Structure 1
Amino acid sequence: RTALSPGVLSPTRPVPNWIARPEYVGKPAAQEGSEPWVQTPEVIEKMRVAGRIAAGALAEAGKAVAPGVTTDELDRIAHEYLVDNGAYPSTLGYKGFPKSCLTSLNEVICHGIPDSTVITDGDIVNIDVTAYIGGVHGDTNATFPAGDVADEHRLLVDRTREATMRAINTVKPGRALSVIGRVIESYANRFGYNVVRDFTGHGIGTTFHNGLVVLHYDQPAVETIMQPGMTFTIEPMINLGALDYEIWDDGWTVVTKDRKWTAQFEHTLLVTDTGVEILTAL
């Protein structure tokens, strides 16, 4: 199974005019980075809707993961599930991103662009979908095996899922935000994996990446305390090999230098009055 290279991008997928675009569509940058970290009750409930739709789109595209299928096809499926449910794919036209979801195979850490790339027996495929509806976003991702995946890789996927859900289970008001990345990095290190540091979770609400940063490694210098109504992602990328990476000429696709495989899972979370709610639960 050879190292991946860029395929052919299909043309921009249409979304019907009635679906509200986020403000940043067709602009070089987004108006984000200074929004409140705690959301209003109205926004939280809207985020439940956006989260459920993103989770649906993810599940639908994940069902299509099989050898012989293209990453473009995964994007077609996600895109149509979002549009059918009245949501705008938040990635489409976000800082020039050309598609409706991110498809990241094997050695691709993240941010792969759906294209003519064909999935083969034994690949692992991350699909990352974000929905924008009711003026809010919901952001979720998962890595799916394609055909007969090597034990080494099934384990990596299963343990990255598990790291993610363990971190989620620590979310509670009054707990330090830094606990998330301590729980993830401990679990990863237990099996000799390395957590990606340069890519992080993020606050999300009426804007996609609102300025709050959630680290996935141990960094106890962060002083942020979780507060009821805060909304953010937990989305650790976990590597078999070393952390070093390259970014393709496309400006998006991040690949391991050593070409060893890497997995990711993501949910959007709400800090409740006493614990956590997974907004992107199926």
Structure 2
Amino acid sequence: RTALSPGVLSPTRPVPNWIARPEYVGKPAAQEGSEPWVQTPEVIEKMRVAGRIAAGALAEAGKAVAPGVTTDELDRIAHEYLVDNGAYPSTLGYKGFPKSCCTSLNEVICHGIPDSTVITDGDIVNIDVTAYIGGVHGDTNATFPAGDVADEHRLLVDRTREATMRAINTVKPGRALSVIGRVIESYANRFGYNVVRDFTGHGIGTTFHNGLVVLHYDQPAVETIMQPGMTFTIEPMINLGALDYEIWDDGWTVVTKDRKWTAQFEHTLLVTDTGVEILTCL
């Protein structure tokens, strides 16, 4: 299976005019980065709605993953499930991003832009979908196998899913945020994999990236302590190869330099009074 190359982009997909657009739509930058890390009860409830819709959109698009399909098509499907549910696709118009979800095949670490690229037997593809409704965001992603995937790749995907669930299970108030990256990296290294460091999880709420950064590798210098009402993503990218990468001319598509495949899974989490709640569930 040859290394991927930029495909061709379909035109901007329309969104019903009555669905509110986040404030950054169409602008070069977003007004985000200094919002409270702990959300109000109102916002937490709204985030449950957003997270459920994003989860449903991810699941719909994931069902279309099959050899023969284009990533653009996956985008068409998630976009339509969001709009149908009254949600705006947060990535659409986010810092110029042109589509409604990110589709990251094989060696694309993250932020692949859905295009003409056709998926072939044995590929793996991450679909990342964010919903904006009720003035809040919810983000989730998962990597899906297409046809007869090699065992190496099936294990990568399964172990990345397991690393993410183990990290989620450690979320609890009063525990250091750095426990998450410790847990992910220890599990990825058990199998000889490498955890991407330059791309991270993040606080999410009324803004898409609110300033809070969640690392997926071991970095005990971070002193942040998890607090009830904090909302953030856990979304480790795990590489079979080296971490060195390149970003395509589009300014979005990140690919591994050695072209070895990489997988990712993600949920939006809430720190509750005693533990965790996954908000991006159906």
Structure 1 length-normalised TM: 1.00
Question: 2: CA distance between counterparts of 1:117 and 1:261?
Answer: 16
C-alpha distance in 1 between matches for 2:13 and 2:6: 19
CA shift digits 1:80-99 (9 cap, x unpaired): 00000000000000000000
Q: Give per-residue Cα distances to partners, 1:1-54, cap 9 Å, x unaligned.
A: 000001110000000100000000000000000000000000000000000000
CA distance in 2, matches of 1:179, 1:96: 34
C-alpha deviations, 1:215-234, integer Å up to 9, x for none? 00000000000000000000
Partner-residue secondary structure (3-state), 1:149: coil
Work out the CA distance in 1 between the residues paired with 2:230 and 2:16.
Answer: 32
d(CA) in 1 for partners of 2:251, 2:178: 30
Cα distance in 1 for residues equivalent to 2:116 and 2:253:
15
CA distance, structure 2, for counterparts of residue 84 and residue 16 of structure 1: 9
User: Which residue of structure 1 aligns with residue 136 of structure 2?
Assistant: 136
Aligned length: 282
Work out the CA distance in 1 between the residues paired with 2:242 and 2:5: 20
Please give the secondary structure, in 2, of the residue aligned with 1:115: coil
List per-residue Cα deviations over 1:223-247 (Å, max 9, x = no partner): 0000000000000000000000000
Deviation for aligned residue 1:271 = 0.1
Structure 2 residue matching 1:166: 3-state secondary structure: helix
Counterpart mapping for 1:134-173 below 5 A:
134-173=134-173
Find the counterpart in structure 2 of residue 201 from structure 1.
Answer: 201
Q: After TM superposition, give the deviation of residue 281 of structure 1 in Å.
A: 1.2
Alignment deviations for residues 180-205 of structure 1 (CA, whole Å, 9 cap, x no partner): 00000000000000000000000000
Distance 1:202 1:281 in 2: 18
Q: Which runs of 5+ in 2 are unaligned?
A: none
Match of 1:20 in 2: 20
Q: Give the structure-2-normalised TM-score.
A: 1.00
**1:157 CA drift (Å):** 0.0
Runs of 5+ unmatched residues, structure 1: none
State the SS of the aligned residue for 2:170. coil
Q: Distance in 1 between matches of 2:94 and 2:224?
A: 28
Q: 1:212 aligned to 2:212?
A: yes
CA distance, structure 2, for counterparts of residue 236 and residue 47 of structure 1: 21
In 1, Cα distance between equivalents of 2:69 and 2:139:
24
User: Where in structure 2 are the equivalents of 1:76-91 lying within 5 Å?
Assistant: 76-91=76-91
1: CA distance, partners of 2:160 / 2:154: 10
Residues 72-124 of structure 1 deviation map (CA, whole Å, 9 limit, x = unaligned)? 00000000000000000000000000000000000000000000000000000
Measure, in 2, the Cα distance between the counterparts of 1:281 and 1:215: 22
1:30 aligns with 2:30: yes
- How far is 1:270 from its partner? 0.1
Q: Structure 1 residue 159: deviation in Å? A: 0.1
